[PDB]
Amino acid sequence: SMEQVAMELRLTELTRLLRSVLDQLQDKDPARIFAQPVSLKEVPDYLDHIKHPMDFATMRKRLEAQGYKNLHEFEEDFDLIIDNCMKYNARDTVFYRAAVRLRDQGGVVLRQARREVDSIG
Structure with a gap:
């Protein structure tokens, strides 16, 4: 249906915006502390x-x-x-x-992303 397509287009556009939001948040982590999952080999107790x-x-x-x-x-x-x-x-x-x-830094980015997601629907 055309309604299904239009919903799909909305999801795709959200996905584009979220990708730019994610790049921006990740630049606030230049040390790459949060880049990858915590290793269970190196913190075997992590899931406890x-x-x-x-x-x-x-x-x-x-x-x-x-x-x-x-x-x-x-x-x-x-x-x-x-x-x-x-x-x-x-x-x-x-x-x-x-x-x-x-x-602290991500809060700024998220503040305006909320406005952009409301704004562009």
Whole structure:
């Protein structure tokens, strides 16, 4: 149906915008601390601590399958990156501090993305 197509076009356009949002967020992580999943080889106990791991590569895989239906879903995954890190790592670590900076800086990007997703429908 033509209605199915138009919905598909909306999803595709959301996917384009989310990809630019994701690039912008990831530039706020120049050290690449959040680029890849936490390794179970190097933190074998990680899943005893963190129930829903997340990282930018896993987000990017989801995005390219057009797996985000709305900005809320995408923000949930970004928030897990930050929130997981701030629970697992202590305050006085390079990891925790990189999370705080990504959160603070990413908030600006997300503030306007919310306006763009509302605005362009």
